[PDB]
């Protein structure tokens, strides 16, 4: 346990300082800066907003992951819901970004209207409010526990079948619909881009669709190998949790340090967008 | 950037038959169109689907073929006629990659005479 306990906060402190200056300069820059904020961008500002208001509470994580939580349940709920609200917000603003490119690439001529309306009303409809209507869970269930010599934030359900339940909620509505979604748009998207001669019908637009899209390809292909291999620790620990899987107290252990390390390391995902804006920025 | 050859020149006589042949090497990822021009007057044009568009001049004389496969344009001369000795340049339209923009290319130039 002190090898977490020395390297849990270590990864927490780095990120928190990376992604509160990356994403306060985004939100800057688009926003007060009123610089580039097309449609791309403006999904991509919704995610840097939402990247930003989940980093401004991982000092508690770092606090209690090295020694205890001495915040209260106030606190404690507050930061599962934005945590909450952060998580499935940043895929699902991934497939709004996804869909807009699939109507700007293969229908390139009477989108305009329906990627408009698509990107300044139907957007909040389709990710915030479903975002914040996930967190009554969160609002149920956080709890600050009195475990034994030190005080405890997590979620307490009435018992592990609401465990799996919300385990396999998360990883349907965090990576199998926002990724069936992409899978398709971008399927169908790379099957033109290597067909068709010339999107629309003049070389700069086809040369601007070409360089609006790689970003959003590199920014998607980067959040999924961050998120993966979390999903897979999940996924055998779920399924110990429905008994397919029996081995020994030392299996479950390795999976839970597994588990605990790689959520850690896939916090990481806060960081893309300024370090795409970066290298790409050049 | 990518290489374009061309060859199929020398000396020939009128209404004989010839065949240019145009390779593309280097960074392909894509070819799109390949043609045979002439300012530039196009006296054939294959697209890679093979819609041939032949010029006015061109009609039942010249008969164009492509293999996708090796990258390759062939253009076949009949009925050879004293306004046709000109020098013929090969074109072609690729692309490097996926997020690349559409590039247009030139081959060196063949010259044809023909014998009176």
């Known amino acids: 346990a002190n090898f977490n306990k020395i390297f849990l906060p270590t990864i927490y402190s780095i990120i928190f300082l990376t992604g509160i200056v990356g994403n306060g300069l985004v939100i800057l820059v688009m926003g007060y800066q009123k610089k580039l904020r097309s449609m791309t961008d403006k999904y991509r500002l919704h995610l840097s907003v939402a990247d930003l208001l989940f980093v401004i509470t991982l000092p508690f994580w770092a606090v209690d992951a090295v020694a205890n939580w001495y915040f209260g349940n106030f606190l404690c709920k507050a930061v599962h819901v934005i945590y909450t609200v952060n998580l499935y917000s940043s895929v699902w603003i991934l497939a709004f970004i996804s869909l807009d490119r699939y109507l700007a690439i293969v229908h390139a001529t009477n989108s305009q209207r329906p990627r408009k309306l698509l990107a300044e009303k139907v957007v909040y409809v389709g990710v915030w409010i479903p975002a914040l209507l996930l967190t009554i869970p969160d609002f149920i269930f956080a709890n600050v526990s009195e475990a034994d010599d030190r005080y405890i934030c997590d979620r307490f359900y009435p018992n592990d079948l609401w465990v799996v339940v919300f385990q396999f909620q998360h990883i349907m509505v965090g990576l199998i619909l926002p990724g069936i979604v992409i899978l398709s748009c971008y399927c169908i998207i790379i099957s033109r881009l290597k067909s068709v001669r010339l999107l629309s019908g003049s070389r700069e637009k086809d040369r601007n669709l070409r360089r609006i899209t790689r970003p959003t390809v590199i920014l998607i292909l980067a959040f999924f190998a961050c998120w993966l291999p979390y999903y897979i620790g999940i996924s055998i620990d779920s399924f110990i949790l429905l008994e397919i899987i029996k081995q020994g107290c030392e299996f479950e252990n390795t999976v839970h340090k597994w588990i605990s390390i790689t959520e850690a390391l896939a916090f990481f995902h806060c960081c893309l967008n300024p370090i795409l804006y970066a290298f790409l920025g050049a | 950037q990518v290489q374009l050859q061309e060859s199929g020149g020398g000396l020939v006589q009128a209404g004989e038959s010839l065949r240019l042949s145009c390779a593309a090497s280097?960074?392909?990822?894509?070819?799109?169109?390949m043609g045979w021009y002439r300012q530039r007057e196009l006296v054939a044009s294959i697209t890679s689907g093979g819609s041939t568009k032949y010029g006015d001049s061109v009609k039942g004389r010249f008969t164009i073929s492509r293999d996708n496969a090796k990258n390759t344009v062939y253009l076949q001369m009949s009925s050879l006629k004293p306004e046709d000795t000109a020098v013929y340049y090969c074109?072609?339209?690729?692309?490097?990659?996926?997020?690349?923009?559409?590039?247009?290319?030139w081959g060196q130039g063949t010259q044809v005479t023909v014998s009176s």
């Open positions: 280097g960074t392909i990822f894509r070819l799109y169109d």
């Open positions: 074109n072609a339209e690729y692309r490097t990659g996926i997020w690349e923009e559409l590039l247009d290319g």
